[PDB]
RNA sequence: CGCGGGGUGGAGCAGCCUGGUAGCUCGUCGGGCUCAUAACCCGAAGGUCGUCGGUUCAAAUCCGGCCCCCGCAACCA
RNA sequence: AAAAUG
RNA sequence: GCCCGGAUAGCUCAGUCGGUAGAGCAGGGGAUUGAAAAUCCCCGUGUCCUUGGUUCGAUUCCGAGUCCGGGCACCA
RNA sequence: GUAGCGGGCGUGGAUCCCUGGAUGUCCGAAUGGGGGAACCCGGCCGGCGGGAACGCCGGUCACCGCGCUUGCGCGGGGGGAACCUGGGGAACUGAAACAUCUCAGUACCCAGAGGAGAGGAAAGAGAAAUCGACUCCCUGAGUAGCGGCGAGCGAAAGGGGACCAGCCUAAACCGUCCGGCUUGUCCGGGCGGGGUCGGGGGCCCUCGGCCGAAUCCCCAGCCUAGCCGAAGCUGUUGGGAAGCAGCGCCAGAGAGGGUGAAAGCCCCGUAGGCGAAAGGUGGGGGGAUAGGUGAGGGUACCCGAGUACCCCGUGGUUCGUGGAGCCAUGGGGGAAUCUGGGCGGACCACCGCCUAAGGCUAAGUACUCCGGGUGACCGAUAGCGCACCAGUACCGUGAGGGAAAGG
RNA sequence: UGCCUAUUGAAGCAUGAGCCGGCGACUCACGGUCGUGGGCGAGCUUAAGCCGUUGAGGCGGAGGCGUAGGGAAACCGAGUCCGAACAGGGCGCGUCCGCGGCCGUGGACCCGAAACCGGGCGAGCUAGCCCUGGCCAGGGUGAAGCUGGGGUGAGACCCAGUGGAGGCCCGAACCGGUGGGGGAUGCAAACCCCUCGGAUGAGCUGGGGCUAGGAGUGAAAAGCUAACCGAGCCCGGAGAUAGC
RNA sequence: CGCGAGGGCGGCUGGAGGUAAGGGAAGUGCGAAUGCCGGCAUGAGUAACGAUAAAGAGGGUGAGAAUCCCUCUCGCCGUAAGCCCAAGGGUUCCUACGCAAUGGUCGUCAGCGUAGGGUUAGGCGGGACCUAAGGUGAAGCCGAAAGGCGUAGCCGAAGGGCA
RNA sequence: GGCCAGAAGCGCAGGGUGGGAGGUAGGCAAAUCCGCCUCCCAACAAGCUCUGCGUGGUGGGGAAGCCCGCAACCCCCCGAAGCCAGGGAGCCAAGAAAAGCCUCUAAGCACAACCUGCGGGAACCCGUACCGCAAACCGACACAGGUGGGCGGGUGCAAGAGCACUCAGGCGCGCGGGAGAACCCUCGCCAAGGAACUCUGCAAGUUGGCCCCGUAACUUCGGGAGAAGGGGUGCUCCCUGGGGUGAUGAGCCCCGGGGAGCCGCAGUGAACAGGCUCUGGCGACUGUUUACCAAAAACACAGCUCUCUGCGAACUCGUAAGAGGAGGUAUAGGGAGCGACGCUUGCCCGGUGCCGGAAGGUCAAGGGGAGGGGUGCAAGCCCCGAACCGAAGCCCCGGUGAACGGCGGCCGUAACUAUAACGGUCCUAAGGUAGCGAAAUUCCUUGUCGGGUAAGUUCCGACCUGCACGAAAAGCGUAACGACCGGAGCGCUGUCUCGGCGAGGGACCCGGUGAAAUUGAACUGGCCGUGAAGAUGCGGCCUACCCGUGGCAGGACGAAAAGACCCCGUGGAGCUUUACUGCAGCCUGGUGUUGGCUCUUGGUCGCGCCUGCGUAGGAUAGGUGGGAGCCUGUGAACCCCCGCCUCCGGGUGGGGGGGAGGCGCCGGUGAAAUCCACCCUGGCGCGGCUGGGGGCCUAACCCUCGGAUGGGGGGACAGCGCUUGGCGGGCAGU
RNA sequence: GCAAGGGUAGAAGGGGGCCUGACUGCGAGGCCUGCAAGCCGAGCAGGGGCGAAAGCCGGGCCUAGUGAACCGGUGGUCCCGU
């Protein structure tokens, strides 16, 4: 949907199998349909000033580490690029 | 013409695919109660199971043949 | 506080 | 095909962390009753599924066998 | 583009052809704002007309992304016949029905790249005391395998060739500048130095020896106009000789076209050989910067994290759940730094291979808008839809469709 | 008793053809299998590429057939497999070109669908809705209200007059389309004449806007969505597939 | 001359290419696919000539006129079949010459052909004014990419406003 | 022919508007401007403003008339849909925005700037021909079609934009000329008869305007009403009543009334211009619909009912953001069915659906690990995996009909017979009530009676064995309405017996221009046969000079559409469902986002003490083991008050007096006691680790709050990611 | 044993005693036949039964009582096992 640090979201398939297991008798497959795995997003408000990121919430922590950096710069309204960028 | 359901004591229903035991209510018959009739009470009887045969040790029961009984279909031109 | 007809 | 509970009086079902076999109903004998019920009494009958083994002994405890009932999954 | 007037210019070297420059309305990424493209309306500075109203004229004013104290300086935007990479991604059909499968990761849509794009220096391959970036071709091989084990799909290693190339960083460790803080000899942000690995690097003591750009330059050479180029006369039939008849000749040139018909020697040419003030291009051969140059002995300081790894859901591979690894990765859990970590088809144990989680990297390869050359290629119902004033006329609201016609 | 086609059977009243002239259909690539014309033979043969040529051909053995077969395999071997077996029984000997026939994969002898799918173009027709404007001659009926009179204890209510209501009436414009005739290679790809319905309303109409293809809109017929809509048009997949 | 497909000979036409023996290659042979493209036939001098509002005559011009100009009669529209404005259309406007074709006939005519003219605004209508629906769109929100919403602002008229 | 324009100033009509004087929690405190309060005056005005109309200095224009070219302009009457305009009254559905324009203060400035006057100047861009209800636009055409707005004269008729004629202005429709047949179209008339026509009075006719009489059932009371059925209408002359403008008298128009008298076949003398009635069906009604075969009894409709929805509503669109719902809030929104109004709307929850049920049953991940397996020398690394704990769903229990739906059979019976109020029995979840009823429903069927008719498969009234009505897919009625469907009458008539005549436009002839489908080739006859069974084309026979023109339709299996019916193809589409398989969507557990603090109860391994009342028997012996040859004192023997087991018998610990005491076989019992153990059964009590359920809070997340580094509300839930299972024709492929 | 047919007492019928050949390895030669299936079968080997023996015995008087492959399940074993 976005990603911030991390990165985007794949597009998985499917498996409708109706069968034994291969540990009794065979096991056939009903249908493959195109699924879409959205990237478990989630939002973060942070103190750098009054900032907001949309961390892939598996990296939420990275938000802070990135906050744990006093790059020495007053207002700019966003000051995210530096953050989200002078990041790594 | 074709399907499918059904003929069991007097009437109305079981029992039949799971073969040997015919069950129920009503009424018929006898005896009580009552002045008497009902009602109520006690006790009995009564069926070639539609027919003509087949298979079987044994056929209401299973398989075919008609006889009436009941239902459902009989559409396109 | 009470179980039809002739 | 796996996982569960089962088999006890005619019938429907109980139960000790081994010591008797018991209820409810049907059924029969009696009282009471206008009638028919409901009440009230006394019973009646058991290989506790079949086998072993456990124990001094087993309804019961465990192995195994057959019938019965419940639950779940397959099906080329 | 010839046909015409009407005028003119050229050996005082025109026209023409190559190179560079100049001017280049308006619309179009369109960029002052608007807008029904090619039109309308404005800010600021300056200049024209008597010029204050009006009106011309020249500059200049989009937005977005990177780097300096507020202004700035570099960049971007759109287009391109295919070819290329990525992100998305069908059905018809096939299976003589059909759902897995097939067609197919194709058609198409989107973003991006460029003369190519991609890939690329091993956490590789796979059984070889082995190999040694990648890409392309030939094999390997319709093999191995995959598969309602149907239809059907289908590798890789190894072997031949083409090409040939290797490299920077992150972290230890040292210095420096800056802004925060619990004003602690501390925390992290930015530069510089170091350091790049199958085993190395940092830091301490012990011994010091050069190759070389993928970037900058220069010339060659090659494009972009051109010049030189051999050798035949007479007669004859004919409307017209290049034919025919008789004597010749050139040839590094007997390719071709053209001239009234069939010419080596008529014209343009052909073989062969010269040419650039100018602008492109250009290691093919050479110059110069950048950068890179050793061996032992000790700590046990560094070696890329929400990563590996395990689990759930999927994709790629010949692999369709299979005994199913490996490579990718949305979700959850979640390490270690060489007594580290991955791989060699579940899992162990041996044996061996390789160093993940940062990046760049020529060439050989693909394509044909464009220029040239050939054709047991077409010759005007063919060949391109167009040999001609065609993507036109005409048709359709539009997307779009789409002729005929040569002598 | 025509030609062709299709047929058990056609002059056939079965299909096709007006006539002529052009265009018009068994191909090519790669595998494979027979046959055949050749080279060479226990052997035969090169791929890609390098070198020359500029309509010279060389080189190149990686590789590929063939020389041994049996067996699922281990494995063995002129044998082998099954088996205890010295029974038995099943299997048990060429390449490279060219040309031809036919097979496999490619449309693959040639035309022809109805349809499926992707991406765009369309509401200048038609349906709905939104903004802003217009339009509806003349007649008719005569609601509520007011006002006056009457009525009653007060009221209700009743009366005249006034008044002018309404998916009200007749009927033009305007909108529509009932019945009939005509029209039927039309004046016209829906028209003309007569006759009909509505006509202050759920009205009609100009201009400016919005909604779209399994979607829109729909006082609902599967109607309308640019003259054929039970799923638009255009281009593409595409030479879909066609046991006809 | 060949069984035949064809092959030679000869005569007119034509006027610039052609191609032996013997061989090799194919876009290689048509009468039919309601085939495709073009040409020309049949029906056929047939149906039609587009509203039943209607014509007649005298002069003109002219190569030639029922069909053009003029005149006098007759008839038809007259909430039009008449005037004015929007839209759309783009020179069809006026003038001089003209008739091949275009007019369903004719044509001296024309809305046709060639040429030359013609459109004049502070007050009319638009813009250097205003907003509507709705568009667009700094911010801002959202989407795999395209892109979807959207504040302000801007655009948008037959409505407001102005001599 | 007797007008047009025209400033200021005059008049005449209007439209706008109270004037004061003080205060002030508002207009995002800036206004002396608004807005609100308070009190002197004033009031169906005046004044002040602003329009329209006349008037206006003055300019302009100005026919019919001959040769080929002359110069007024006044007076009444009618009179708007236009103007004054933002006028008035009434009503419910409650009726744009912004700028210009006034006014108020801000910043700033007052040497600016505005306001009124007067003179000089300045004043860009675009459109402007022409067609424009059509031959110039849209329809391939010089197409009988389509196209928005304004003006649109006069007379006549009740009125009018109607109808007839006609001004101005413009047309006579881009082939003509003759004939004078059939037939076709369009049009007129008709003896006698009058629906006999025919599916049907289809069509055509009759009637038609206005004034006056006069009009029934039925009714929701409005209406049925133009009900029906009649009479009048022209022209001349006489008298007379009110109106409007004048002026109160005259012309001028506007509505009437009463008498005479004239003419025709006829007076709305032509054109416009209803025929009517009785009775059924359906639908309440006006409306809407299949553009191009269906205008309806179909859709809609007010109205009734069921149902969802508490607001960040439900529901719809969208992946999302967001939007619609609605700037609404249950007297509101969404979905469904029925369909004004009247009288009503029965019985059945067995099966399906929906709603309700903190129990049980079953149940996926996941939790859990008894136990087993593969490996190594090992520790280990890996694997399978039982109990048990586990949602929604389903099973199960129950409600529910204006939820889907459903709503019986066979026998007998009365004192003539008939029939059956009564009875018997089988089945059911329950057995169709009211009202209708051979019906838009009835097969038999033209049912059977009545009515209507000379005659009636239709129609109307009746009766029921209702093949197969019936209550909200409503039932039965119903005034009014209908281009709706059926049956009758009257009137009128060519629809008809039965056809005839006449007019025009074609057809026909001449001149000019000149198509189309179709077409194997044609030299293309009849009858009998024959043949693939319907022959111009074979056979036999029979007829027949050659070629045209006007006409008719029997044939050429005539034309046109590769049959729409039927079947076939392992063709296609749309639709359905409890067909298969999916997907959207919705439900659901486990995780992530995700945090504090309590309460509580489970399951687990520990550990800590109890726990165990057969029959003999010192008596509440658990089990086998060790056992001699056993321990109290810090002191038992006995005692009380006490928490605790239990069946009571019989106990498990407390404490002080007290102070000696106390054992092991015993004798029996299947088995023997002191004490130590390890352990079976069950319970209790602290600890580990996991769980579940209840509350409280805030800080994430969410919603809001005069613009918040915040305050309220909600709150670890919701939402969202990943994963589990389920529902699932809403959609897709088959 | 059960449908019909053919066959049959010089037994295929009825009874009795011992048995388990309702074997393992094979299989000449044929029947039938598109394929692939189905059917008969002497004989050899091994190790057995019944009979003194000759001998008979690879199910049943005979013809129906059945289903390719693929995919799996249970066993077993000389095989394979990246």
């Amino acid at each position: 949907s976005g990603k911030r640090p991390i990165v985007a979201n794949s597009i998985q398939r499917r498996g409708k199998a109706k069968r034994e297991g291969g540990v009794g008798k065979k096991t056939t497959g009903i249908s493959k349909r195109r699924q879409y795995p959205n990237l478990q997003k989630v939002r973060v408000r942070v103190a750098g000033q009054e900032i907001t990121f949309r961390v892939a919430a598996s990296h939420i922590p990275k938000v802070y580490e990135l906050v744990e950096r006093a790059k020495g710069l007053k207002l700019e309204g966003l000051s995210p690029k530096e953050i989200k960028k002078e990041l790594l």
Side-chain angles (χ1 to χ4, degrees):
Chain A
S1 299
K3 57 235 181 180
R4 304 295 232 187
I6 178 176
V7 78
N9 61 285
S10 63
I11 297 72
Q12 311 166 313
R13 281 279 225 299
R14 250 300 145 177
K16 305 320 306 174
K18 174 188 303 176
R19 29 50 78 178
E20 310 94 296
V23 174
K25 290 194 177 182
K26 71 168 186 171
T27 148
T28 67
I30 272 305
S31 186
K32 287 182 178 171
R33 176 268 196 157
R34 293 296 215 58
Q35 199 212 302
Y36 191 71
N38 301 261
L39 28 43
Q40 215 292 30
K41 203 44 54 46
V42 178
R43 208 171 309 295
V44 193
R45 298 162 59 189
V46 89
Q49 181 41 55
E50 302 289 56
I51 310 181
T52 274
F53 305 154
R54 199 179 182 195
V55 77
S58 88
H59 282 225
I60 317 103
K62 198 62 146 290
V63 154
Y64 295 74
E65 179 170 59
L66 229 187
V67 169
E68 296 176 293
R69 314 289 193 65
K71 297 175 182 174
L73 277 185
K74 307 186 67 175
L75 187 61
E76 176 61 4
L78 306 191
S79 76
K81 305 172 183 176
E82 29 297 297
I83 294 292
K84 310 162 181 176
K85 218 60 181 178
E86 285 300 299
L87 186 189
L88 285 173

